[PDB]
Amino acid sequence: XXXXXXXXXXXXXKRISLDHDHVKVWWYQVSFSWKSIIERDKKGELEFREANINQPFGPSWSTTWFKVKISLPEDWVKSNEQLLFQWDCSNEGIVIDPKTLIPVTAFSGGERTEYVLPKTSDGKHFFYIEAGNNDDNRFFHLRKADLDARALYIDFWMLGDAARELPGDSWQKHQARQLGNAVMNLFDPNDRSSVRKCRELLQREYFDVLTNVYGIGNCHIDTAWLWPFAETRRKIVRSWSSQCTLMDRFPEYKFVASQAQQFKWLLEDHPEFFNKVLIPKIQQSQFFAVGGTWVENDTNIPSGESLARQFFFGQRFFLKHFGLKSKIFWLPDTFGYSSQMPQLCRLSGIDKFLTQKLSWNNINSFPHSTFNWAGIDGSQLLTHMPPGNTYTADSHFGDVLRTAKQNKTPEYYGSGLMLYGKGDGGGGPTEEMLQKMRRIRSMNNRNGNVIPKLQVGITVDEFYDDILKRTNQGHDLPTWSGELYFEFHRGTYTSQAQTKKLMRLSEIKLHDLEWIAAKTSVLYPDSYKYPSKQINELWENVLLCQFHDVLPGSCIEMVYKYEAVPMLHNVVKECTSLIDKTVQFLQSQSKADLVEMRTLGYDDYIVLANGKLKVIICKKTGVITSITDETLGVEYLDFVIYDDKPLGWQAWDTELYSVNQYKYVTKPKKVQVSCNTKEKCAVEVIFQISEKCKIKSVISLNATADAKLSKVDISTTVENWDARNKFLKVEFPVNIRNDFASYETQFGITKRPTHYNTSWDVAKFEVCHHKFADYSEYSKGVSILNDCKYGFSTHGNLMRLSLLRSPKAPDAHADMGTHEIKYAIYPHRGALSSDTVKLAHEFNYCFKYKLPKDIGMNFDDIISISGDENVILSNIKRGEDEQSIVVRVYESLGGESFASLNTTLNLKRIEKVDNLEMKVYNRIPIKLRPFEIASFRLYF
Amino acid sequence: XXXXXXXXXXXXXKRISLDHDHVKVWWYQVSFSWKSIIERDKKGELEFREANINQPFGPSWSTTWFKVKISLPEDWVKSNEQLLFQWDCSNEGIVIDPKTLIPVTAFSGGERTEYVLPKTSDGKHFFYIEAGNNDDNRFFHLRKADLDARALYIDFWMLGDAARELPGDSWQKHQARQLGNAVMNLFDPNDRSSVRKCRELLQREYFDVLTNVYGIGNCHIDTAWLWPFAETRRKIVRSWSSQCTLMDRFPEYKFVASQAQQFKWLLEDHPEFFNKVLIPKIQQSQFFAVGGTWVENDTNIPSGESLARQFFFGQRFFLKHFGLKSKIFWLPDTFGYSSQMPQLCRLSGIDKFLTQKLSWNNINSFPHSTFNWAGIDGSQLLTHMPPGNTYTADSHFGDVLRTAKQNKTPEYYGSGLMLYGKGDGGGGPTEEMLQKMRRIRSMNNRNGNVIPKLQVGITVDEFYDDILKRTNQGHDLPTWSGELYFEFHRGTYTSQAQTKKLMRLSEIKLHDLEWIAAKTSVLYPDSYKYPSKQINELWENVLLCQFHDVLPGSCIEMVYKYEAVPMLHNVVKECTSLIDKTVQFLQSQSKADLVEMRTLGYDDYIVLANGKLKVIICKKTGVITSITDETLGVEYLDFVIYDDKPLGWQAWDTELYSVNQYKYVTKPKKVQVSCNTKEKCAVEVIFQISEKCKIKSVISLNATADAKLSKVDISTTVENWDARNKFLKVEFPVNIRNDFASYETQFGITKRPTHYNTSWDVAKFEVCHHKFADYSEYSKGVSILNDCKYGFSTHGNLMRLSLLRSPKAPDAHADMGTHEIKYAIYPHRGALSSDTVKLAHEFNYCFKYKLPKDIGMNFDDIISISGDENVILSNIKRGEDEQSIVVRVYESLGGESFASLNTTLNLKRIEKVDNLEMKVYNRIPIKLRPFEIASFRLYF
């Protein structure tokens, strides 16, 4: 059918010319800054040397600079020709043509790329290019030219490619075939006069339901990944330069940036001439900042304060010369989404959101891609969702009509959605031939509006103007309550808990000193008292490791050591330095000060004797048998049984072997008890397994009301040895029947069933959590507190916490070494149903005691008339510039009770203020809605 | 490709002979019993007259008898020929060849059918056949014959039909084509010698992974449907006779019967010779009784007592000569299934269940058709599920390989499942050519076991022996918690509430006198005291209208009048007669007796002033604005707003018009108040709509602690007029956020979300309920009590009760006429969370007061030491034969608390006994499991 005759023939087979200049070429390498090397160039004879040939290398962390001094050949003849220099793209680097140094040019784009030499100025210039190693040898040759001949070659390549994508039943496929025919006729027998003429004839063969197809070129950059931050800091400057050279070459282009800190990275590295580059670039057009967010992160693990700073400290750039923005919120690589996001968005002045994964196309009780998200708070979020092709559809895309068809099926709207650029790497490239892409697509389809029109230059702001018109304001709409569920690729989330232990301890610790440091305002006045400039710098370093890829611990071994480096550590070390600092001139009013933040036995007979409860491990079995309440009457049989099953997948996802029996840790145990006291009781029982390894958990608790508490504390200490690729968990089967699982999400409590959605794919079902998870019919249940482990699962009502994971990924630090784990099991009652939530989250508190000399009185309870047990205040902090402070509260128990808010203060005034710390004229609500975040601001 | 050459040719086109006997033929009709007409035949000249021709008719409820006296033609020649008489099947009737009357023969089979004349006895006999009218004229002609020639014609017809079903890619399709070729060769030119010879040649062309394909011929009969009970009582005797004549013709055949009462219907109508027919039939083989159930019904609407009697009173036949049974439970036409069924099955000694609808094939978190059902009680149920082809796959099936392929995909097992016979009609037919069906399918596939073997004679009992072997005992298995959800065809469930009002009032009323009538045992001894024989006859009539098709009210107009007839009415009338009877010699110990069963204002300012709560309707709007708790703090905005939307579908399913605006009942209302008192407060507000109709609801409640109660009572009285095809509902939006909806199912409380499963198809989502439905985060919520309406819906947390429905089905009584409706709205609190459930269900109680002369003392509280608020005792009754009584309890609140059971009695003993009232040796449990039915028995 002549299918392989037209397609594979001409696609393979003045005009393009290749000249070679061997001399004047220099090479440089550092085996030990662009401004530092410019002074080391002209002076004497340094490591800069003549290359003139291909330079091989070997694996190193070193970077290799390269210098090419080119003299323009002849005068007029080769000037009209297009000047070009081809380079082989290495792992990283930069390219410059500095005098002395004005420019910064793009590198990080794909292995194929073009560098244009200015035809405006006739003379000799210089070139500075470095190549990051990880080895990749560069192929460098000068390439002259024509533009019209190469255009036809590209247009034909995108022609026949579009012929294959078009339906064979349509006449267009037979048309495009005949179009690929006539072109091949004059193209074959090597004729320049025919090629240029045939290009004109092809255009004549080209030009002879309201819908729209658009796209926005973007670069998604991970600040920490298998390449480090310092190296990727050089990678982000390559993303800006590719646009700058594209602007003069092509107009109407659109770029978006998920990092507000990206601006600062460029302003710190290139403060001089590139601060004045951004202003005409951003203000006029062609640039948009999405979300104005300081960090792109997973929202499940951290608190709302992490989401509070990124909005506020990312809005700080708006105070500088900046501020052309968009209403879209972009978290493409983020796994999972919080249920408080619809509430956080509207308050942050951002009305749109984008989600890559976590969706399906079918009747789900859900129509399509485009979606209006209604959280459990009751608020609504209009969000724009890309199809199942994700962001890799338009990434490095020359295929034209290929994914255009697959985009139309999931989406209805009046139009589709395309995201240009790659989100996997040091940063995404932006192709320079996109100008022809938009043009050649306007060659196939006619102009005027009848058939869908092709415009790549439209902005999402105008796109959101279209959705406000076509579709109704709505009452009954696409509706999904809570979060979304698809293949999560949880992976490292529960793996390498040691980086969580450091972070989660640093999380609370940095969240510790915040508010109380504003309570010393009255004591010693200067600015009064608050580490405004001091704590601002603190949040700068912490948010850097909190990114979506970095925080769970999925990365190479090099940057993983930078996670356990002072980056995480010194934060705790500086905060523990400040907490011992501010105390000196403060606590001096305290003789003996207990510092805590709030606002108002037997062996053979196997018993630990007390009133509250009883939990018993059988003899020689090693497994807890009876957990039973006398007053309640609930008896348990199948507790705390540790289970170890291997893992055969990589760091990304988790895939267990087919029907693999999980090895129990039960063995010929021995019995022991740590101490002897009414205050302290710890009974020790040893567990062992094949390839002997010591797995230790501890038992701690306070009796009743001599010790006082309602909850046990069980901490696990395990030093891993030998066998890798294993996944360890501890089971807490409730032996109870409930279709609902109580779990506390970020700023609230979400309601999720015991069984996953019927559309679920992956066998293994695990859920990420903050602190505790419960099962409650409201008259009773079982509550499980935990530390350093964010994961858990619903087994058919068997509570299983994930202690450790060891992926087969190329990381050797995820396998062996000691670990300190902690968790708990708590008895549940209807009266204690609101108590278990209160005794869970903030239990991470660490007791600390210190005393100065005595002059004063140390008892002051300064909080004013609120007293709501159903509400919990997560964050209260100051401002930037005044020093007005903000107060943010959220209701713990919601969905049933309507919390009356009497919260107020004295000696000053108060007004309700959103999460962006921006002034809002409703006033303080006397009653809080269920599952509502209440944030306020305080002024003198 | 010669596809239509072989298939449509020979399929259309001594041997078959047609003779006509005009004389000796008689006809009979009753325009005004088989035993009554036999005495009216030979005597004188009655309405029995000579027919000899085709007799036309007209629509009537009459039945037309027919008599054919046939003399055997010649002697030997036409004796060897197969004697047959063809009849045109009418709506109903019976066929007999009585001397004087021995036989009863089958009729109700399809319009085509065969009646064989005995070749054993040479002589003259008689024929008695009646035809039910609803007119259908009968075509009657005597047909002689051969058996070998007709066999080839059938075998060839099932051959070419199997050729089309077989894949064209396989050689079998090309083979069967060539098989259809050679046969057509000798068949075409009218040769008897060739046909008989070619039949032998075809058999030679026939005969030349472990799996099994089986089936069981069955007849599903609805006792009340578009044809009445008295008429279908004649229809059930036609189902038995078709088997009896089939037994001698073909062996190994299997029949099953979902009705245990079906035996009694035959024993009452034919007590003499047909009581001795069943014993060799059932005992040896070929017959199985499924479930031993008295009735086949919807389990959602009635109580457990209805499910208790059907097992017990259906097990009464086992006491007679009976009792070859099966472990399968069959409810094919039943819409929806209870969650207590896994618990009820194991106790009833029945380990298997069958479900037609309510399933899907995909990964649902569910593998396949075959399923092990785990209820919310924790118990497991192994159930056998037919594919998506339901029971109509093998119904009237000559198509052979057709549905054989579609059966294999949903099911894995080692084998598939097929159900022969039709479940829609007066009763299902069983074809007589099934003998050849099993044989011809053994002609295509070889014998011995390699390929799947075809046996239609295997019993499900042996089938359950295979499932115990191949598959594992299991831990992780197919798992679905609670009920199942697919297209329900709710329909008449909420339509025609008047038949529910009569039944639901009769439900409780018949459930009333049961236990307390055993409490008078000591008073006047004879047998002591209990209506053992009296209340047994009561349950006989009531269960008759409780069937799955009859109870919801989906039926013709004729039997619908039989629903409102004394059948439902006299039950209440006889029970209200007995309650005024037994009182006379009982209550005489009571001077003044209050009889109840248990065991221990303003207008312009628009307010009804009291302490407990406040509910306000705005002026002129007609809609309730603020329902607010002061102590709790929950304020409501959007209550009790009646909504009317039309309906464009039939009685079966419910389909609303595409985006049709539901008309509000708001209008220029006027304000009024019924009475004036602290005891009685009713404020009246009128509603009206287009084509004016008076829609009235009432307001009743008791204040606090002069009136005392925690709950309002709102009863609706509406007389329908004019416009039909409408669906009326009243909305109670909570204005709250909950992912869970609290609802009390039969014997317990099931947990269902606010959103339907993602695999749901139909837009409109409505749920059937018993009494109340709630939404609880356990600290608060909203409780809705209702009467006579079993339906409700979850709108995104808007409570909507269905008042009335008017389908477009051919029933004129579902449209107009008055209706009395009642419901309620209740305030919810954590402490009252167990109270709302207690104040909901049994509120249907009706106050009654009567007094006799005074001698005695009327206060005795006889219950002994239980006192569990979380448990509720639904039923306690006596036995059959002694007169030992049984006690059945079930826990209301479960899934959280483990209820300690101290329940016991005095002066006698007690033992745990299952739902079948059969003696069980665990003893009385001291603690009850969550969601567990506890049934016991009491002996002297």
UniProtKB/Swiss-Prot annotation, chains A, B:
Keyword Zinc annotated: yes
GO MF, one annotated term: carbohydrate binding
Keywords for the protein's UniProt record, in alphabetical order: Acetylation, Glycosidase, Hydrolase, Metal-binding, Vacuole, Zinc
Co-factor binding details: Binds 1 zinc ion per subunit.
Required co-factors: Zn(2+)
Disulfide bonds: none
EC annotation from Swiss-Prot or TrEMBL: 3.2.1.24
One GO biological process term: cellular response to glucose starvation
Enzyme class, UniProt record, top EC level: hydrolase
Any one Gene Ontology cellular component term annotated for this protein: fungal-type vacuole membrane
Chain residues that bind Zn(2+): H220, D222, D333, H548
Catalytic reaction list: Hydrolysis of terminal, non-reducing alpha-D-mannose residues in alpha-D-mannosides
Entry similarity comment: Belongs to the glycosyl hydrolase 38 family.
Note: It is not specific for the 1,2-alpha-mannosidic linkage. Present with 319 molecules/cell in log phase SD medium.
Subunit record text: Composed of isoforms with three constituent polypeptides described as [(107 kDa)-n (73 kDa)-(6-n) (31 kDa)-(6-n)], where n is 0-6. The 73 kDa and the 31 kDa polypeptides may be proteolytic derivatives of the 107 kDa polypeptide in the vacuole. Oligomerizes in the cytoplasm and retains its oligomeric form during import into the vacuole.
Function: Degrades free oligosaccharides in the vacuole.
UniProt protein name: Alpha-mannosidase
Organism: Saccharomyces cerevisiae (strain ATCC 204508 / S288c) (Baker's yeast)
